Amino acid sequence: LGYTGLTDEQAQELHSVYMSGLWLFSAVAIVAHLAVYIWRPWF
Amino acid sequence: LGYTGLTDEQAQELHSVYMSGLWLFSAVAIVAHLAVYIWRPWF
Amino acid sequence: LGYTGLTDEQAQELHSVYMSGLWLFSAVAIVAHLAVYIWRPWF
Amino acid sequence: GYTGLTDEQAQELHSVYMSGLWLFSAVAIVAHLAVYIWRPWF
Amino acid sequence: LGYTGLTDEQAQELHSVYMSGLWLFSAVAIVAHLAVYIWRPWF
Amino acid sequence: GYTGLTDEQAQELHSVYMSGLWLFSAVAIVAHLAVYIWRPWF
Amino acid sequence: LTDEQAQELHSVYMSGLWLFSAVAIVAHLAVYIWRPWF
Amino acid sequence: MSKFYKIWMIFDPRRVFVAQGVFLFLLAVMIHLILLSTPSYNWLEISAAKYNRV
Amino acid sequence: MSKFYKIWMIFDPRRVFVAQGVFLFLLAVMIHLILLSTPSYNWLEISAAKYNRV
Amino acid sequence: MSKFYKIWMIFDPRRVFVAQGVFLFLLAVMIHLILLSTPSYNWLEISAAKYNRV
Amino acid sequence: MSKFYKIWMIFDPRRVFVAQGVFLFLLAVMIHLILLSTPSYNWLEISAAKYNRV
Amino acid sequence: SKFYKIWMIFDPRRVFVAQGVFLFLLAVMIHLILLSTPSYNWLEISAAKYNRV
Amino acid sequence: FYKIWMIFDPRRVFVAQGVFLFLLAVMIHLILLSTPSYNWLEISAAKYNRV
Amino acid sequence: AEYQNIFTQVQVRGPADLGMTEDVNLANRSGVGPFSTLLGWFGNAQLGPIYLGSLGVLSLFSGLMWFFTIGIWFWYQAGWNPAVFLRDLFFFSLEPPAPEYGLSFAAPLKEGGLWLIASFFMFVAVWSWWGRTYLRAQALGMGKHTAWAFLSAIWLWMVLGFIRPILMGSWSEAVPYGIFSHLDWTNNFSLVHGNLFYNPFHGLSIAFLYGSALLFAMHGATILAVSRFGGERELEQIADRGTAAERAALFWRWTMGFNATMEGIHRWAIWMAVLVTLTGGIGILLSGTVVDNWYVWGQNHGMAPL
Amino acid sequence: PEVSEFAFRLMMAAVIFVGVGIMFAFAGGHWFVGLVVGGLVAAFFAATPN
Amino acid sequence: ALLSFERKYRVPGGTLVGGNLFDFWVGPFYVGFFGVATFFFAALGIILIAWSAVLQGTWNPQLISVYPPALEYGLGGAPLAKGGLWQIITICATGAFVSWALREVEICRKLGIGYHIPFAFAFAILAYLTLVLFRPVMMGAWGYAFPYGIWTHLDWVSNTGYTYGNFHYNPAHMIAITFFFTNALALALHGALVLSAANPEKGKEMRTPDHEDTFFRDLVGYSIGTLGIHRLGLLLSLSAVFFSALCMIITGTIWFDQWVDWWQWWVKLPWWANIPGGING
Numbered sequence A, B, C, E: 001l002g003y004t005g006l007t008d009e010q011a012q013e014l015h016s017v018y019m020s021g022l023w024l025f026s027a028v029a030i031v032a033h034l035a036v037y038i039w040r041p042w043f
Numbered sequence D, F: 001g002y003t004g005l006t007d008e009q010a011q012e013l014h015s016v017y018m019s020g021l022w023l024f025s026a027v028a029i030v031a032h033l034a035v036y037i038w039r040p041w042f
Numbered sequence G: 001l002t003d004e005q006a007q008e009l010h011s012v013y014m015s016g017l018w019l020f021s022a023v024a025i026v027a028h029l030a031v032y033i034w035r036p037w038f
Numbered sequence H, I, J, K: 001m002s003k004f005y006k007i008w009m010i011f012d013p014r015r016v017f018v019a020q021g022v023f024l025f026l027l028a029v030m031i032h033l034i035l036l037s038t039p040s041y042n043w044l045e046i047s048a049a050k051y052n053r054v
Numbered sequence L: 001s002k003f004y005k006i007w008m009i010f011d012p013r014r015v016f017v018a019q020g021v022f023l024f025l026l027a028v029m030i031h032l033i034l035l036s037t038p039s040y041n042w043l044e045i046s047a048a049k050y051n052r053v
Numbered sequence M: 001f002y003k004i005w006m007i008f009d010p011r012r013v014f015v016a017q018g019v020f021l022f023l024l025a026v027m028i029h030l031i032l033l034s035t036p037s038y039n040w041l042e043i044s045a046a047k048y049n050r051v
Numbered sequence N: 001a002e003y004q005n006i007f008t009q010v011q012v013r014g015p016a017d018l019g020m021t022e023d024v025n026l027a028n029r030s031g032v033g034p035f036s037t038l039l040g041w042f043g044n045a046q047l048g049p050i051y052l053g054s055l056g057v058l059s060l061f062s063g064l065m066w067f068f069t070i071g072i073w074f075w076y077q078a079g080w081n082p083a084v085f086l087r088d089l090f091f092f093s094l095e096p097p098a099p100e101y102g103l104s105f106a107a108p109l110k111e112g113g114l115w116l117i118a119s120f121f122m123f124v125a126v127w128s129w130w131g132r133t134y135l136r137a138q139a140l141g142m143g144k145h146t147a148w149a150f151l152s153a154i155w156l157w158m159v160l161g162f163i164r165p166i167l168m169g170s171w172s173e174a175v176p177y178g179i180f181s182h183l184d185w186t187n188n189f190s191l192v193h194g195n196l197f198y199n200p201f202h203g204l205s206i207a208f209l210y211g212s213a214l215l216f217a218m219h220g221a222t223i224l225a226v227s228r229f230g231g232e233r234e235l236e237q238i239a240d241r242g243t244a245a246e247r248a249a250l251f252w253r254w255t256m257g258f259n260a261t262m263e264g265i266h267r268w269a270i271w272m273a274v275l276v277t278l279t280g281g282i283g284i285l286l287s288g289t290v291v292d293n294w295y296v297w298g299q300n301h302g303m304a305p306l
Numbered sequence O: 001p002e003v004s005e006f007a008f009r010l011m012m013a014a015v016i017f018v019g020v021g022i023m024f025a026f027a028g029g030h031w032f033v034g035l036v037v038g039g040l041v042a043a044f045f046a047a048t049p050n
Numbered sequence P: 001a002l003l004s005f006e007r008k009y010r011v012p013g014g015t016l017v018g019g020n021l022f023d024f025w026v027g028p029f030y031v032g033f034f035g036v037a038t039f040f041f042a043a044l045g046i047i048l049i050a051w052s053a054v055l056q057g058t059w060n061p062q063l064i065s066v067y068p069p070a071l072e073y074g075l076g077g078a079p080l081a082k083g084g085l086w087q088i089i090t091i092c093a094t095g096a097f098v099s100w101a102l103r104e105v106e107i108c109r110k111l112g113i114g115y116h117i118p119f120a121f122a123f124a125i126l127a128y129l130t131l132v133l134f135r136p137v138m139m140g141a142w143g144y145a146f147p148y149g150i151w152t153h154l155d156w157v158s159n160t161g162y163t164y165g166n167f168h169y170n171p172a173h174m175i176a177i178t179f180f181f182t183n184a185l186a187l188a189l190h191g192a193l194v195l196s197a198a199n200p201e202k203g204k205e206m207r208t209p210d211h212e213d214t215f216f217r218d219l220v221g222y223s224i225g226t227l228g229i230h231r232l233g234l235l236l237s238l239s240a241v242f243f244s245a246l247c248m249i250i251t252g253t254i255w256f257d258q259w260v261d262w263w264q265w266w267v268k269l270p271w272w273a274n275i276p277g278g279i280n281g
């Protein structure tokens, strides 16, 4: 059923927590780039 | 064959997920190349 | 024979798919080389 | 019998090995013919 | 005589095939030398 | 026989060894004659 | 080393030494004719 | 051109994903570093000349 | 030629693909780097001369 | 002459196929490097002169 | 003369064949290298001078 | 004669291998010495005779 | 002189005697080349006007 | 004559030792390779198996790219001539960018750009190998002494190529990739900073390079001396002290006046070797950043006449 | 004479390495030709005792 | 003051000179015949270095130096204030080192162990004798030996090295440096590997030499063994010192010019000396 001994419902929950932290990290990064680009564009 | 023990059901389900990410990665790269070419072509 | 443990039927399946990728790889190479020769020929 | 093959297994294997060998030389001859027209070395 | 585990029949057919390869190699060598001698003789 | 060879084996072995020895020397003599005809070194 | 075995070896060895030295005698003799060093 | 899904019946999925992930990371940085090395594509220096910076 | 499928019965598919994958990438990286070194095919510099970027 | 298949009753096909592939590629790259070094066969630099790219 | 076949009893075919082929390849490379060094027989330079390429 | 007794002390395998390496090196040395002397360098001698160099 | 092949290994004497003899031969030959009066190649090259 | 236990007079060979699987992922571990008779005259004859996992792939492929990048630059520097490449192999070099660029990454590939590419491959390959060195010990339930001792050597490696060039403000301070090239860098590094001999940490670093040579000659000779009492198996001497450990200790007790244990001598060994590169990193990091002339600094600190 | 076969081979190789080195340095036109040919043969000679 | 297991090892015998005249222990030290010699030579040489300091006029230990006799004296004696004291201290140091090596041989016999340790110490002695005695004797004067100062014997190394340019190009130097770096690398690996086996992760059983082989086969694909690593450690250091003394016995006696120019024999081999391109062509 897997390579790591993790049930599918366990994998479903773990991935949902991960993607939540990834959207949070990505959304903060987009603000950082958007603020830096307005301050001093690199294009 | 039989080097890893993944069944046809597992192999089809593994390939379908992997090839899904391949086109997701390839689409982002294609857009990036098109964007850079408009800004500054190399040919 | 059979150093790898593959049967004759399994070897044909492996080789048939291997050539499919090989021809796909070369077709991109032929188009790539044809594009370069039209652009900047070396002969 | 050092490699543990039979007599017919060597016959079968060598037939394919020569089949690839003549395939390689056929490309090499064409490659060498193409270069000689472009720029002979003799 | 021994020293390897071969037999009289095994050594004779081993020599027959080997020596035939020796003449085949020398057949190419004579032709190659002859063409070189026509082209740029060293004598 | 302190090396494993019998006496009768030794005679056959030395017969073949000299057969190659004279054959090799014979080809050398022909080569030296050709070189001497070409340009003598004496 | 058996004495009969050791006797054969010394005899055959001396047989080889005389043959080699005999040809060298001719070889030195030939060079003296071709070019005397003394 | 469809039976490629069988490749996961031969190759360990864990090793393949790791090698592929390593390859793309090393490849991406090398190309980005090449573009910085070429003065015609260094996007940091290009903007400096365009916007009159240091 | 039609009997080339027996190479896999001799060579491990896992080992051949690893050796081939490392082979092709280093062959391809070598060829690009040769063209990059030669001024006649450095496409990064050829574009710069064409569009007056330097 | 039509009895050369018996070489494969002496040599393991795996070690010959590996050794031959190493030998031929090393031989081929060596010849290509000899031609690149000789300026009368440097097809990269020959083409530059012919189309006056430099 | 006809008794030379018995060397295959004394000498192992496997080590003889490997040692022989290594001897011949080095001999061929050694002779080819000598001819390349002599300007009279260096065929790459002879073609260049004959066809006026350098 | 009686020279065949030599194979009852010396192992034939090493004798034939030792003789082979000795024979090849002795031949190359003579070939190399001839090339070193300009009087017998057959490659360059043919160059002068045929108006090559 | 009989016990020379007993005191010493018969294998050792032949290798030691033969190898020294060959080296002594090539050295004596090389000296003749080294001196400009017994280089039979150069002597003939001057004799036949081929140098 | 007397046997000195320097070469094995008799070799015994049996089944190939596949190792023990404490927590090791047995899939990643390969199969046993050949047996070397030549290596068997000195140590073990068995080659392999080797564990190539996730950090093995990253380290070996990055190390391949670092090695292959420098090789292609050498072929370019040879004009693609196999003979010229062979001739000038020890003279070719891949050099860091010119000091005019400072730490900037805008240097052309022929003027220190390939150096940055090769340096990145080396950075990934060396650091990934430290992780692999750590993880290989963990899977066997062993201590991390190998990982932390390696970290001492990485310290000098990072000071030479990364940390100090950042602190000096230019990549031109770093080490070129060549055989005779990095020897010239070493010779010129001393001349620029005024006789590096008077760097106190270079002096200490040498004290532990000689100390390591002194200590391994002592320890290696001691064990071969008491190897007749089963002294080579130091691990079982620690568990149950035998006459080998007592004679080894009593030799240095009667000679020097103090000795070590069978386990404590390996704490001297590891600590003597790590101080070679731990001290060397500080002395190199202090050169130019804090002291730009070690002979003049020495004169103000004893060490030299005024 | 109580000399090991390995030790006797090392004595006899040392002569060969010095000997064959001189003859091929002469023929090779450089002492490095003598070194490689003289060294390789002695490395092969000393590694194959009885 | 004995180790708990030392009583059964203190037996009379294994003395090259004497047998009971100097067969006793002073504390833990064994006072042999050569222990009396070692102490006398060690003590005299130290006090001469102390005396040479008052002739020099300094008490800072890092400034004290004993210089060899000047190059004008050749290979003979010298005044004590100039270089005569160096010759006595060199004799005293030579006597102390050989006595220390000879005293270790008596300890080996009394414990019944092999003579690997005194043999390995003689390599250090021969390297030292090369620098102060053998090499100066060849060159012709005592003034080529290094002085006996903490920071001034470094000045001898620096000055001697730069006489021949960059000393990195001495081929025997490169071999010796390679052995020194390998010896320190192997010492770090050897100490760490044994310590990790004896001190496992936590609450774990002590590991076994089968774990020691397995760790290094997993890591680098090979394992020299427990006997192999100790033979290697001894041989790396003896080789490092052998090529150390080799590189200095040939410097200034056979080779006299820059060591960089030596490597032009390779770059000027006849078959590629004239091929254009590269660094030297």
Ligand code: BCL
Binding pocket: G020, G021, G023, G024, G025, G027, G028, G031, L010, L015, L018, L022, L030, M014, M015, M017, M018, M019, M021, M022, M025, M026, M032, M038, M040
């Ligand atoms: C101007 C001078 C003349 C000339 C003057 C002389 C004179 C004078 C002599 C020779 C002799 C010889 N010359 Mg002439 N020679 C000239 C030019 C040449 C040239 C050349 C390229 O031009 C060559 C190849 C030779 C070659 C020879 C040899 C045929 C012969 C030396 C044999 C020998 O070395 O035995 C020694 C070698 C061996 C014994 C080989 C065996 C050793 C092995 C390797 C070790 C033993 C191992 C084995 C298993 C043990 C068992 C068997 C043992 C042999 C017992 N000469 C010139 C032209 N030459 C000598 C001779 O006549 O010999 C009878 C001699 O006295």
Ligand code: BCL
Binding pocket: N126, N153, N154, N156, N157, N160, N185, N186, N187, N189, N190, N195, N196, N197, N201, N202, N205, N206, N207, N209, N276, N277, N279, N280, N281, N283, N284, P157, P181
């Ligand atoms: C004229 C030159 C100067 C001089 C200039 C320098 C400079 C500059 C330095 C030294 C350094 C040192 N000098 Mg100094 N040194 C001089 C004179 C000496 C003398 C002498 C007798 O005169 C001696 C014995 C020494 C000895 C030493 C060492 C104590 C120290 C080097 C430690 C070391 O091992 O680093 C070598 C080890 C490393 C660099 C770590 C490497 C580990 C990495 C992580 C592994 C990478 C592997 C790589 C990728 C390859 C992989 C291959 C595959 C895996 C197979 N020097 C003279 C005065 N010296 C170094 C030091 O730190 O001292 C302060 C240093 O930087």
Ligand SMILES: CC[C@H]1c2cc3[nH]c4c(c3C)C(=O)[C@H](C(=O)OC)c4c3nc(cc4[nH]c(cc(n2)[C@@H]1C)c(C(C)=O)c4C)[C@@H](C)[C@@H]3CCC(=O)OC/C=C(\C)CCC[C@H](C)CCC[C@H](C)CCCC(C)C
Binding pocket: N210, N213, N214, N217, N218, N221, N255, N256, P038, P041, P042, P043, P044, P045, P046, P049, P089, P092, P093, P096, P097, P100, P104, P117, P118, P120, P121, P123, P124, P147, P148, P149, P150, P153, P237, P238, P241
């Ligand atoms: C050959 C391999 C390495 C090695 C091995 C080695 N050394 C050894 C041994 C071995 C096997 C011992 O058994 C022996 C020992 O007992 O060690 C604890 C020893 C030893 N190696 C020592 C030191 C040492 N080894 C060094 C090097 C090496 N030793 C090699 C790299 C160095 C270096 C590189 O500098 C030093 C300093 C000692 C700790 C010890 C020998 C002790 C001894 O000789 O005791 C009797 C003598 C005295 C007590 C001192 C006498 C003092 C003199 C009378 C006056 C001073 C003279 C001196 C020359 C002045 C120097 C001035 C400046 C240059 C500083």
Ligand SMILES: COC(C)(C)C/C=C/C(C)=C/C=C/C(C)=C/C=C/C(C)=C/C=C/C=C(C)/C=C/C=C(\C)CC/C=C(\C)CCC=C(C)C
Binding pocket: B001, C010, C013, C014, C015, C017, C018, C019, C020, C021, C022, C025, H003, H004, H005, H006, H007, H008, H009, H010, I030, I031, I034, J025, J028, J029, J032, J033
């Ligand atoms: C210095 O000199 C230079 C370099 C300039 C000139 C020298 C040039 C030289 C020597 C060039 C040499 C070139 C050579 C020999 C090239 C060979 C190229 C080859 C053989 C390429 C082959 C490529 C094949 C590919 C990429 C195939 C890929 C296939 C797949 C990815 C499919 C995967 C396989 C599957 C899915 C099988 C599934 C079936 C089962 C049962 C699992």
Ligand SMILES: COC(C)(C)C/C=C/C(C)=C/C=C/C(C)=C/C=C/C(C)=C/C=C/C=C(C)/C=C/C=C(\C)CC/C=C(\C)CCC=C(C)C
Binding pocket: E013, E014, E015, E017, E018, E019, E020, E021, E022, E025, J003, J004, J005, J006, J007, J008, J009, J010, K024, K030, K031, K034, L024, L027, L028, L031, L032
């Ligand atoms: C520096 O000196 C110069 C170079 C100038 C001149 C010097 C030149 C010199 C010294 C040259 C020396 C030349 C020599 C000694 C050349 C010898 C050449 C020989 C003998 C070559 C032999 C080749 C033999 C071959 C290629 C045989 C091939 C055999 C086959 C291909 C058959 C395959 C074998 C099989 C199938 C085994 C059969 C197995 C069974 C079970 C029957």
Ligand SMILES: COC(C)(C)C/C=C/C(C)=C/C=C/C(C)=C/C=C/C(C)=C/C=C/C=C(C)/C=C/C=C(\C)CC/C=C(\C)CCC=C(C)C
Binding pocket: E001, F012, F013, F014, F016, F017, F018, F019, F020, F021, F024, K004, K006, K007, K009, K010, L016, L026, L029, L030, L033, M022, M025, M026, M029, M030, M033
């Ligand atoms: C500068 O001056 C120089 C150095 C050039 C002049 C100096 C010249 C010198 C020192 C020349 C010395 C020349 C010598 C000593 C030459 C010796 C030549 C010999 C002994 C040649 C012998 C050759 C023997 C051969 C070729 C034998 C071949 C045998 C076969 C091919 C048959 C194979 C059968 C075998 C091996 C075993 C059969 C097995 C059974 C069971 C019967």
Ligand SMILES: COC(C)(C)C/C=C/C(C)=C/C=C/C(C)=C/C=C/C(C)=C/C=C/C=C(C)/C=C/C=C(\C)CC/C=C(\C)CCC=C(C)C
Binding pocket: C001, D012, D013, D014, D016, D017, D018, D020, D021, D024, I003, I004, I005, I006, I007, I008, I009, I010, J027, J030, J031, K025, K028, K029, K032, K033
């Ligand atoms: C420096 O000197 C220079 C370079 C200037 C001149 C020197 C030149 C020299 C020394 C040149 C040397 C040239 C040589 C020796 C060339 C050799 C060429 C050869 C041997 C080519 C052989 C090619 C063989 C090939 C390509 C084999 C193909 C084999 C296959 C495709 C294998 C097929 C087998 C399969 C599929 C499985 C078989 C197993 C079963 C059970 C059927």
Ligand SMILES: COC(C)(C)C/C=C/C(C)=C/C=C/C(C)=C/C=C/C(C)=C/C=C\C=C(C)\C=C\C=C(/C)CC/C=C(\C)CCC=C(C)C
Binding pocket: H033, N067, N068, N070, N071, N072, N074, N075, N116, N117, N119, N120, N122, N123, N157, N158, N159, N160, N161, N162, N174, N175, N176, N177, N178, N179, N182
């Ligand atoms: C025919 O040969 C082929 C082509 C097949 C392969 C041949 C390869 C050859 C000939 C390789 C030669 C390699 C050599 C000579 C290597 C020598 C290396 C040496 C001597 C290195 C010495 C010191 C290097 C150091 C200290 C490097 C330190 C680097 C770092 C500490 C990290 C560097 C990272 C930096 C500077 C920043 C990178 C970050 C970014 C974002 C680019």
Ligand SMILES: CCCCCCCCCCCCO[C@@H]1O[C@H](CO)[C@@H](O[C@H]2O[C@H](CO)[C@@H](O)[C@H](O)[C@H]2O)[C@H](O)[C@H]1O
Binding pocket: L036, O017, O018, O021, O022, O025, O026, O027, O028, O029, O030, O031, O034, O035, O038
């Ligand atoms: C132990 C292995 C190495 C042994 C090397 C020992 C030292 C050399 C021994 C042979 C000495 C004579 O070796 C010879 O010397 C001359 C000196 O110019 C050089 O030879 C060079 O000049 C001579 C003429 O003087 C030419 O014939 C020759 O073509 C040329 O290469 C070579 O060095 C070698 O032909």
Ligand SMILES: CCCCCCCCCCCCO[C@@H]1O[C@H](CO)[C@@H](O[C@H]2O[C@H](CO)[C@@H](O)[C@H](O)[C@H]2O)[C@H](O)[C@H]1O
Binding pocket: P075, P076, P077, P078, P087, P090, P091, P094, P132, P133
């Ligand atoms: C172990 C390593 C260190 C060993 C140190 C050995 C030092 C002791 C040397 C003993 C031998 C002395 O050797 C002797 O030295 C004196 C020194 O004036 C030399 O004396 C020489 O110089 C004096 C200087 O005024 C002149 O009279 C004259 O030029 C000559 O006699 C002798 O020519 C030499 O025979």
Ligand SMILES: [Fe+3]
Binding pocket: N219, N223, N234, N266, P190, P194, P230
């Ligand atoms: Fe130990």
